[PDB]
C-alpha cells in the first residue's frame, strides 16, 4: 500500500558483524547491534496516532 513513507527499512546488518542483525530500537532508540551494540536510525517518521485500533462499536 502506497499510503505512507517508510514501512520496511530494508537495511542489511551490522558493519562489524554483517551476520548479527541489528535490533530495532536500542533500549528505546534506533537499531542496536547485539554485538557492537551500535545504534543506527532516527527518521522512521511519525505515524503512531492515525486511528490505530481494533474495530469499533459504533
Binding residues for Zn ion, per CB under 5 A?
14, 16-17, 33, 35-36
Burial class (CB in 10 A: 0-12, 13-18, 19+), 38: middle
Shortest distance, position 46 Cβ to Zn ion, whole Å: 28
Q: Is 14 annotated as a binding residue?
A: yes
Nearer to Zn ion by Cβ, of 7 and 25: the residue is: 25
Rg (CA), the chain: 15
CB of 30 to Zn ion, least distance (A): 13
Contact assessment for residue 31 and residue 22, using Cβ atoms and an 8 Å cutoff:
yes
Query: Which amino acids are annotated as binding site, given as ranges?
Result: 14, 17, 33, 36, 52
Amino acid at each position: 500500500a502506497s499510503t505512507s513513507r517508510l514501512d520496511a527499512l530494508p537495511r542489511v546488518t551490522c558493519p562489524n558483524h554483517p551476520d548479527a542483525i541489528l535490533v530495532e530500537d536500542y533500549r528505546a532508540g534506533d537499531m542496536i547491534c547485539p554485538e557492537c551494540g551500535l545504534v543506527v536510525g532516527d527518521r522512521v517518521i511519525d505515524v503512531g496516532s492515525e486511528w490505530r485500533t481494533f474495530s469499533n462499536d459504533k
